[PDB]
Design a protein around this ligand. Structure first.
Ligand code: NA
Ligand code: NA
Ligand code: NA
Ligand code: NA
Ligand code: NA
Ligand code: NA
Lengths: 457, 458
């Protein structure tokens, strides 16, 4: 069965199955995700998630990133750190479309701190469990062509991320293939959040809950709870989250091939929906024609701004107000880039989003939907056309952006993003120590060195 | 106003004065039946697993695990474990459109009432109001699709509407503003929705346990200021994601409010199995009496063919169940156990009983037929059974309504006797009788601590 093929691989994959490339790519993902989390601990949604979670205590506990004072049961530590990771839509993005690392990394750091292993949990053990969690998500996404395109009904992290967390937790716990299977079945009953709460303050909890519920499923499987033995094979099981469900068995452990070895992740340079990174790139490029040697946008002289984009309705927001809406707005990212010449973390403060000059530009934006601009991160582009009041029009088309898997961030730029994100809450020495540890994570003998640094300062 | 706003307005705005005599009468029955299901459910392995998992969580506030004075949990986890107990044996109440409404709501309110004592005290009438708001919200959400009138095909309804009913009941207990009631619903939507495949497995009871737990979590997060989509119930890509054909409608105004429970009663089960098998058991019980009257039951080996004419409900089509959970979801096993044993009782679903060779011999003779008029709705469906013997004689019987269905509801006496049988496994007779009396007069109770103190046992 398909379900059995997943359980067999989760249990059976070994450190020796890792490739150099999958280790290199997952180390980049781990660093980027830690940075997103640390920056996320400054957000209101993180404060709410932590205030809720703090009602719970346990003799078996792990720590919230950067917050030595907040010790939580590992399920709730993973919840809060996951909320932080996804709080600003700054975390990594894959193809088919999901945010994979945020569902997996805080699970494994929580469990490593809360539950000593024998032998002790090593950097390679972490990389193995992490890559199993990533791999399971990607294989589940490939169960339907529709997961290649932007989601219409369920938010993918809540669907595949929940099972990825369960798989990573099952790997950490050393569960038998039978108990790995049960963990997946139990996780299915915790999976699946609708798309409506995207672009609201609740969206980050989709990743926090994926992390939390995956651990809960693994724990319950460990204790002996049973679920449907064919849960991934059934239209009324995991297929309930898909419009057209086409599942397939995994490859055999013999000469296993990782999806991450043939599909890199995208890393964001600013905290917003990935589709808007194409918009930002094109708007930055067209701006050169408008400002000449003056460095100033001729705002009053612009007649019309046309964005030729894929039809992605949850990112079509002509007048966003909240930070969450602006992160999901083709239009705001275009106009802020034209006006400001860049997009940064403060671009999504409410006081920037509602600037009168921004709203003047937003009043001039029209969307067009070219038929070949399909709503997939592997296909889509943005073409922007700016028409001036004298009738002159300048056009710029971006089919990728720096940080996309087609143009991946350098190690240097990835580390500089991490430094910017983490220095809000950690000291310089801790930031540099984390860079060095993660860069050489396969050499780390004891993960407690990593989890101790994550407490700060 | 939006559909979502109309729900928040009603949750916040409904008052004890809006309750009718009939909704109080029917909900008092639901509360007693659900307590009994829970008490009996504390004997099950799934409850013990849920309890062992939950015991790792401590909090400064705590509530009781029913019948377990040795176990106190944060109210979220108490509602979780008691909800698992309620649904652990598929013995809890069933509504139209199809769901199990009380299990998602009662353990929420008993947990919160004990963990967060109020002044003025939380009265029986306050409990009845918050309970009936939770029930009402579920019913209105079920009516957002014609398909909820029929058996589910993709998502298990308790996980969908139960989660929001819990959120509503918790929001009512906590006295949240209408705005925060709205946010609680929106947050709850992101916690809702479990697929059907885990029905007939040991995980199904967690659908009700999680509905209870996640509704409280949503209300707590709303109380802390978390915000979600303001039109979550209006949107195809919000709550509509769980429905094939979504057709939401505003609630009526509170100034002229009518409760769904006033025009649609619940069904109470007589044995712990899927409601659709209660028609099968009823029909098989009668055909058995006919066979015995003609001296044609024994030997069981002279039965050649057993035809069940039933609705097309494939997750209850299980010709050779082996586990307890499969047998509770098997037309075939319920028919065969009734024919062999002459009744269906709690031990009928122990695996030793399920896997008796005589049972397997009867199961191998069963065939299902699907009459087109036997629609998969608890309002419509029936069971016809035909037993043919080796000598050719055919005995046919039929059940259009079984005792316990809303059309033929359990008398108060029989409902109380079911409670006694279920609750006496964990409670002393004095406590059992005290709970019957308290619930029967719940509108007169000044302080719900009198009720929650008894729930600890013995
Ligand atoms: Na979807
Ligand atoms: Na499907
Ligand atoms: Na145009
Ligand atoms: Na769900
Ligand atoms: Na729908
Ligand atoms: Na009859």
């Amino acid at each position: 069965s398909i379900t059995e093929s997943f359980a067999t691989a989760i249990h059976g994959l070994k450190v020796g199955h890792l490739t150099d490339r999958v280790i290199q790519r997952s180390k980049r993902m781990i660093l980027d995700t830690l940075g997103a989390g640390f920056l996320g601990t400054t957000t209101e949604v993180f404060h709410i998630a932590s205030q809720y979670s703090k009602i719970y205590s346990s003799n078996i506990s792990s720590t919230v990133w950067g917050q030595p004072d907040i010790r939580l049961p590992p399920t709730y530590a993973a919840f809060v750190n996951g909320v932080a990771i996804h709080s600003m839509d700054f975390d990594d993005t894959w193809h088919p479309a999901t945010h994979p690392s945020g569902a997996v990394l805080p699970v494994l750091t929580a469990l490593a701190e809360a539950l000593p292993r024998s032998p002790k949990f090593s950097g390679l053990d972490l990389l193995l469990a992490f890559n199993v969690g990533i791999e399971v998500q990607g294989r589940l996404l490939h169960f339907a062509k529709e997961a290649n395109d932007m989601p219409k009904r369920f938010h993918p992290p809540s669907v595949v991320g929940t099972l990825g967390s369960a798989a990573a937790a099952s790997k950490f716990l050393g569960l038998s293939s039978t108990k790995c299977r049960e963990a997946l079945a139990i996780a299915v009953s915790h999976a699946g959040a609708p798309m409506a709460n995207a672009a609201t303050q609740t969206k980050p909890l989709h990743i926090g809950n994926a992390a939390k519920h995956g651990i809960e499923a693994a724990f319950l499987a460990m204790l002996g709870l049973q679920g449907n033995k064919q849960v991934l094979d059934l239209e009324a099981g995991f297929g309930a989250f898909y419009a057209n469900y086409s599942p397939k068995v995994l490859p055999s452990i013999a000469s296993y091939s990782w999806l991450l070895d043939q599909q890199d992740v995208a890393f964001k340079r600013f905290p917003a929906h990935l589709s808007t990174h194409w918009v930002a790139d094109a708007a930055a490029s067209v701006r050169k024609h408008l400002v000449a040697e003056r460095a100033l946008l001729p705002t009053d002289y612009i007649k019309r701004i046309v964005l030729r984009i894929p039809n992605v309705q949850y990112v079509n927001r002509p007048f966003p107000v909240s930070e969450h809406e602006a992160r999901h707005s083709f239009q705001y990212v275009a106009c802020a880039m034209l006006l400001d010449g860049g997009i940064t973390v403060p671009s999504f403060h409410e006081c920037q989003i509602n600037r009168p000059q921004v709203r003047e530009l937003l009043s001039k934006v029209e969307l067009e939907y070219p038929p070949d601009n399909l709503p997939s991160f592997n296909i889509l582009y943005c073409e922007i056309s700016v028409t001036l009041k004298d009738g002159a029009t300048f056009t710029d088309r971006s089919d990728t952006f720096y940080g996309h898997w087609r143009k991946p961030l350098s190690q240097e730029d990835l580390e500089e993003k991490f430094r910017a994100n983490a220095s809000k809450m950690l000291s310089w020495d801790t930031v540099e120590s984390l860079i060095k540890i993660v860069k050489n994570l396969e050499d780390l003998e004891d993960c407690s060195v990593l989890t101790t640094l994550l407490k700060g300062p």
